[PDB]
Enzyme design. Structure first.
Site, PDB file in Angstrom:
ATOM      1  CE1 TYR A  57      13.644   1.102  16.264  1.00 21.77           C
ATOM      2  CE2 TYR A  57      14.162  -0.710  14.799  1.00 21.77           C
ATOM      3  CZ  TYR A  57      14.161  -0.167  16.062  1.00 21.77           C
ATOM      4  OH  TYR A  57      14.710  -0.909  17.073  1.00 21.77           O
ATOM      5  CB  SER A 130       7.336   3.975   9.090  1.00 16.53           C
ATOM      6  OG  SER A 130       7.048   2.646   9.473  1.00 16.53           O
ATOM      7  CG  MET A 131       8.266   3.390  14.401  1.00 19.04           C
ATOM      8  SD  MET A 131       9.681   2.895  15.420  1.00 19.04           S
ATOM      9  CE  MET A 131       9.200   1.220  15.810  1.00 19.04           C
ATOM     10  CD1 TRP A 155       2.833  -0.314  13.206  1.00 22.27           C
ATOM     11  CD2 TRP A 155       4.306   0.639  14.616  1.00 22.27           C
ATOM     12  NE1 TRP A 155       2.891  -1.085  14.346  1.00 22.27           N
ATOM     13  CE2 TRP A 155       3.805  -0.538  15.218  1.00 22.27           C
ATOM     14  CE3 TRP A 155       5.260   1.397  15.304  1.00 22.27           C
ATOM     15  CZ2 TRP A 155       4.186  -0.931  16.502  1.00 22.27           C
ATOM     16  CZ3 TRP A 155       5.642   1.003  16.570  1.00 22.27           C
ATOM     17  CH2 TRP A 155       5.085  -0.132  17.172  1.00 22.27           C
ATOM     18  CG  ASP A 176       3.280  -0.644   4.546  1.00 19.63           C
ATOM     19  OD1 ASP A 176       4.011  -1.489   5.114  1.00 19.63           O
ATOM     20  OD2 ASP A 176       3.357   0.619   4.736  1.00 19.63           O
ATOM     21  CG  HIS A 207       6.875   0.583   4.952  1.00 22.11           C
ATOM     22  ND1 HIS A 207       5.784   1.014   5.701  1.00 22.11           N
ATOM     23  CD2 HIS A 207       7.992   0.850   5.666  1.00 22.11           C
ATOM     24  CE1 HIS A 207       6.243   1.537   6.829  1.00 22.11           C
ATOM     25  NE2 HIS A 207       7.560   1.489   6.825  1.00 22.11           N
TER      26      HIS A 207
END
Length: 261
Positions: A57, A130-131, A155, A176, A207
């Protein structure tokens, strides 16, 4: 099996560069995603598999670019993408990741493109942050013919990836606070009962612990290359490095299942 390159060593996989010269280009007309950079081996000696890598993101190719040459120098075609929107969510990121693998297969047929005939379009992998890691796990759930997945600090809105049969390595970052390990990477890992899988948690990691410029490019690179070579190429020279529990103070946690020595 699709064995390319010399027998690996821990030290050679920890090095910045594999045995193949990497060239790259910018995709002229991206098809179904924002922008792409293709990294490819000149030297390979046979068709190589392709890997598509998606950022998180707000993020761009910069965050994930170090994987391009790291993998490509070992015998892969790597596409790093920018999404149509920096605010795209995981399912959109998955769609775009698969659109990038499609366009790599298109450029494999484009007599003009530097990667014509270089790709076994039957051997593909997914990575992302992540995303973009959640999107890699959605790509793997929706496309079980993918040979490997290696998301970092993933995520998603759901942690249940129980349908995934694709060999999946999850890079986690111990500290994270964006996608904490105990609510994201570890529950995602724990949901998968049908596949070869692995969980590598970086000691003290934020992260961004697997992003370009990180303090563990030796270990993280060794493990990504080893996982992709083992499962994308069915190269059992890499079973030792793919399944190994590293003896490293850099690793705060390690789990694995169905990873045959």
């Amino acid at each position: 099996s699709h064995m390319r390159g010399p027998n690996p060593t821990a030290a050679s996989l920890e090095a910045s560069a594999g045995p193949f010269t990497v060239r790259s280009f910018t995709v002229s007309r991206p098809s179904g995603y924002g922008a792409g950079t293709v990294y490819y081996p000149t030297n390979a000696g046979g068709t190589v598999g392709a890997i598509a890598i998606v950022p998180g993101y707000t993020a761009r190719q910069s965050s994930i670019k170090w994987w391009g040459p790291r993998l490509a120098s070992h015998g892969f075609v790597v596409i790093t993408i920018d999404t149509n929107s920096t605010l795209d969510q995981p399912d959109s990121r998955s769609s775009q990741q698969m659109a990038a693998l499609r366009q790599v297969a298109s450029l494999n047929g484009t007599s003009s493109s530097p990667i014509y005939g270089k790709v076994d379009t039957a051997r593909m992998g997914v990575m992302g942050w992540s995303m973009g890691g959640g999107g890699s796990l959605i790509s793997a759930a929706n496309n079980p013919s993918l040979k490997a997945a290696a998301p970092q600090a993933p995520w998603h809105s759901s942690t249940n990836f129980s349908s995934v049969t694709v060999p999946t390595l999850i890079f986690a970052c111990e500290n994270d606070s964006i996608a904490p390990v105990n609510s994201s990477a570890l529950p995602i890992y724990d949901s998968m009962s049908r596949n070869a899988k692995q969980f590598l948690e970086i000691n003290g990691g934020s992260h961004s612990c697997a992003n370009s410029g990180n303090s563990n490019q030796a270990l993280i690179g060794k493990k990504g290359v080893a996982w992709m070579k083992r499962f994308m190429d069915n190269d059992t020279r890499y079973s030792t490095f793919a399944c190994e529990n590293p003896n490293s103070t850099r690793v705060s946690d390690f789990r694995t299942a169905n990873c045959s020595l």
